Design an enzyme around this catalytic site. Structure first.
Site, PDB file in Angstrom:
ATOM      1  N   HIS A   1     -61.709   2.302 -17.499  1.00  0.00           N
ATOM      2  CA  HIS A   1     -60.315   1.842 -17.665  1.00  0.00           C
ATOM      3  C   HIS A   1     -59.520   1.734 -16.337  1.00  0.00           C
ATOM      4  O   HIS A   1     -58.571   1.282 -16.213  1.00  0.00           O
ATOM      5  CB  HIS A   1     -58.964   3.389 -18.143  1.00  0.00           C
ATOM      6  CG  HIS A   1     -59.308   4.529 -17.792  1.00  0.00           C
ATOM      7  ND1 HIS A   1     -60.540   5.670 -17.097  1.00  0.00           N
ATOM      8  CD2 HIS A   1     -58.454   4.746 -15.917  1.00  0.00           C
ATOM      9  CE1 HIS A   1     -60.265   6.465 -16.459  1.00  0.00           C
ATOM     10  NE2 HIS A   1     -58.673   5.685 -16.314  1.00  0.00           N
TER      11      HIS A   1
ATOM     12  N   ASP B   1     -65.081   4.665 -22.498  1.00  0.00           N
ATOM     13  CA  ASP B   1     -64.986   4.798 -21.372  1.00  0.00           C
ATOM     14  C   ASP B   1     -65.794   4.626 -20.334  1.00  0.00           C
ATOM     15  O   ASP B   1     -65.471   5.729 -20.087  1.00  0.00           O
ATOM     16  CB  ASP B   1     -63.561   6.037 -20.984  1.00  0.00           C
ATOM     17  CG  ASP B   1     -62.638   5.599 -19.921  1.00  0.00           C
ATOM     18  OD1 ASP B   1     -62.850   4.238 -19.482  1.00  0.00           O
ATOM     19  OD2 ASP B   1     -61.523   6.216 -19.309  1.00  0.00           O
TER      20      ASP B   1
ATOM     21  N   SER C   1     -61.205  10.112 -11.674  1.00  0.00           N
ATOM     22  CA  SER C   1     -61.721   9.237 -13.406  1.00  0.00           C
ATOM     23  C   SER C   1     -62.658   8.408 -12.197  1.00  0.00           C
ATOM     24  O   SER C   1     -62.166   7.918 -11.687  1.00  0.00           O
ATOM     25  CB  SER C   1     -60.229   7.813 -13.207  1.00  0.00           C
ATOM     26  OG  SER C   1     -59.398   8.954 -14.330  1.00  0.00           O
ATOM     27  N   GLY C   2     -63.595   8.045 -13.648  1.00  0.00           N
ATOM     28  CA  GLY C   2     -64.683   6.406 -13.199  1.00  0.00           C
ATOM     29  C   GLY C   2     -65.552   7.401 -12.402  1.00  0.00           C
ATOM     30  O   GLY C   2     -66.702   7.301 -12.627  1.00  0.00           O
TER      31      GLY C   2
HETATM   32  C1  LIG Z   1     -53.362  11.453 -21.587  1.00  0.00           C
HETATM   33  C2  LIG Z   1     -53.834  10.472 -20.398  1.00  0.00           C
HETATM   34  C3  LIG Z   1     -53.532   8.914 -21.136  1.00  0.00           C
HETATM   35  O1  LIG Z   1     -52.541   8.145 -20.685  1.00  0.00           O
HETATM   36  N1  LIG Z   1     -54.314   8.227 -22.602  1.00  0.00           N
HETATM   37  C4  LIG Z   1     -55.393   8.523 -22.438  1.00  0.00           C
HETATM   38  C5  LIG Z   1     -54.989   8.960 -24.346  1.00  0.00           C
HETATM   39  C6  LIG Z   1     -53.772   8.683 -24.535  1.00  0.00           C
HETATM   40  N2  LIG Z   1     -53.287   7.168 -24.643  1.00  0.00           N
HETATM   41  C7  LIG Z   1     -51.966   6.855 -25.636  1.00  0.00           C
HETATM   42  C8  LIG Z   1     -52.946   6.725 -23.002  1.00  0.00           C
HETATM   43  C9  LIG Z   1     -54.429   6.936 -22.711  1.00  0.00           C
HETATM   44  N3  LIG Z   1     -53.072  10.433 -19.077  1.00  0.00           N
HETATM   45  C10 LIG Z   1     -52.018  11.498 -19.471  1.00  0.00           C
HETATM   46  C11 LIG Z   1     -51.086  10.547 -17.181  1.00  0.00           C
HETATM   47  C12 LIG Z   1     -52.360  11.001 -17.303  1.00  0.00           C
HETATM   48  N4  LIG Z   1     -53.547  10.533 -15.610  1.00  0.00           N
HETATM   49  C13 LIG Z   1     -53.375   9.729 -15.080  1.00  0.00           C
HETATM   50  C14 LIG Z   1     -52.414   8.501 -14.794  1.00  0.00           C
HETATM   51  N5  LIG Z   1     -51.723   7.043 -14.642  1.00  0.00           N
HETATM   52  O2  LIG Z   1     -50.962   9.031 -14.769  1.00  0.00           O
HETATM   53  S1  LIG Z   1     -53.595  11.401 -14.654  1.00  0.00           S
HETATM   54  O3  LIG Z   1     -53.519  11.683 -13.046  1.00  0.00           O
HETATM   55  O4  LIG Z   1     -53.212  12.945 -14.769  1.00  0.00           O
HETATM   56  C15 LIG Z   1     -55.391  12.116 -14.356  1.00  0.00           C
HETATM   57  C16 LIG Z   1     -55.749  11.185 -14.625  1.00  0.00           C
HETATM   58  C17 LIG Z   1     -57.852  11.273 -15.159  1.00  0.00           C
HETATM   59  C18 LIG Z   1     -57.979  13.286 -15.942  1.00  0.00           C
HETATM   60  C19 LIG Z   1     -59.051  13.077 -15.714  1.00  0.00           C
HETATM   61  C20 LIG Z   1     -59.124  14.262 -16.380  1.00  0.00           C
HETATM   62 CL1  LIG Z   1     -61.374  15.616 -16.306  1.00  0.00          CL
HETATM   63  C21 LIG Z   1     -58.243  16.148 -16.474  1.00  0.00           C
HETATM   64  C22 LIG Z   1     -57.380  15.603 -15.525  1.00  0.00           C
HETATM   65  C23 LIG Z   1     -56.832  13.825 -15.444  1.00  0.00           C
HETATM   66  C24 LIG Z   1     -55.416  13.860 -15.005  1.00  0.00           C
HETATM   67  C25 LIG Z   1     -53.677  11.235 -18.171  1.00  0.00           C
HETATM   68  O5  LIG Z   1     -55.105  10.419 -18.347  1.00  0.00           O
END
Ligand SMILES: C[C@@H](C(=O)N1CCCN(C)CC1)N1CC[C@H](N(CC(N)=O)S(=O)(=O)c2ccc3cc(Cl)ccc3c2)C1=O
Ligand SMILES: [Ca+2]
Lengths: 232, 53
Positions: free
Chosen positions: A42, A86, A183-184
């Site tokens: 991703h 992923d 991430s990654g």
């Molecule tokens: C559910 C998943 C999302 O959008 N997804 C996942 C599956 C659901 N489908 C529907 C869409 C993609 N999501 C929601 C937002 C979130 N973030 C990504 C973003 N661009 O805002 S985050 O930055 O809060 C984030 C990213 C990575 C993380 C990794 C860990 Cl281990 C813990 C917390 C983290 C928080 C995020 O990843």
């Protein structure tokens, strides 16, 4: 990384940072060998490079090195809606020269990792990501011990599907978790003072929210795939 | 707890059970020691080790 502490000198040498055209980190990676970096599929959405040996993005240490990417190898079964599969591997144009703060993490064998590493109490996650859900990214590299979470509990807590290619780690209520920009990056497990790659930072419903855990790509399901990618 | 379930079968790294017997092995870049248990780095900066110099 929310909570945890700074990686001290030499403590997180397998950390890589994917940098955009403006020299800003947008994702992490794990050094697997002199030519290969492990990251999240991703994260690959246009032109980027890989930085290694950095712990403080605001000072010139003398250990830092930028590398150009020769080939991007993304898992062909990666799905954007669920984040299943992923995982990606990057081949660099020039080899990484190992030194202080620059060394690879070990790839474990599948069965041993699943019965012995993934049954340990905790793993370690690291990154230059946000220090709280709505803050800025860290200028300092951070690490955090995260407990392995029971698989059934994780499925119950999640609003989205947890596939066979994912596992959960972190805390129920405590204010410690990975976050945006991490991430990654590496999830490693320590065994007799040797650190093995066990996960890839993937996703979560916010950062350190109550009744929510961090979701990681299950590296042990992809060991043959990684091995193939690193030969061709 | 028997073999690999008993303290990792005394192996430094990977433990495998073969015909009621413990067999140890090591990650790439390590060689199995003479005792067939310990893992010894073949060169500088072996995988999985925090750096000291
Ligand atoms: C559910 C998943 C999302 O959008 N997804 C996942 C599956 C659901 N489908 C529907 C869409 C993609 N999501 C929601 C937002 C979130 N973030 C990504 C973003 N661009 O805002 S985050 O930055 O809060 C984030 C990213 C990575 C993380 C990794 C860990 Cl281990 C813990 C917390 C983290 C928080 C995020 O990843
Ligand atoms: Ca620096």
């Amino acid at each position: 990384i929310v909570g945890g502490q700074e990686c001290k000198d030499g403590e997180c040498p397998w950390q890589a940072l994917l940098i955009n055209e403006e020299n800003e980190g947008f994702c992490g990676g794990t050094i697997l060998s002199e030519f290969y970096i492990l990251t999240a599929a991703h994260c690959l959405y246009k032109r980027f490079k890989v930085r290694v040996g950095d712990r403080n993005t605001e000072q010139e240490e003398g250990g830092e090195a930028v590398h150009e990417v020769e080939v991007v190898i993304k898992h062909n079964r990666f799905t954007k809606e669920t984040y299943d599969f992923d995982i990606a591997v990057l081949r660099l144009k020039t080899p990484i020269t190992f030194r202080m703060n620059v060394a690879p993490a070990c790839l474990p064998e599948r069965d041993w990792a699943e019965s012995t590493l993934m049954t340990q109490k905790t793993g370690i996650v690291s990154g230059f990501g946000r220090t709280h859900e709505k803050g800025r990214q860290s200028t300092r590299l951070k690490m955090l011990e995260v407990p392995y979470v029971d698989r059934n509990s994780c499925k119950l807590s999640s609003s989205f599907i947890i596939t066979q290619n994912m596992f959960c780690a972190g805390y129920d209520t405590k204010q410690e978790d990975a976050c945006q920009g991490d991430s990654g990056g590496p999830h490693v497990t320590r065994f007799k003072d040797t650190y093995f790659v066990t996960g890839i930072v993937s996703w979560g419903e916010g950062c350190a929210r109550k009744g929510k855990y961090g979701i990681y790509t299950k590296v042990t399901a992809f060991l043959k795939w990684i091995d193939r990618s690193m030969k061709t | 707890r028997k073999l690999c379930s008993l303290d990792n079968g005394d192996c430094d790294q990977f433990c495998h059970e073969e015909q009621n017997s413990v067999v140890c092995s090591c990650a790439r870049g390590y060689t199995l020691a003479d005792n067939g248990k310990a893992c010894i780095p073949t060169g500088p900066y072996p995988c999985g080790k925090q750096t000291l110099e």
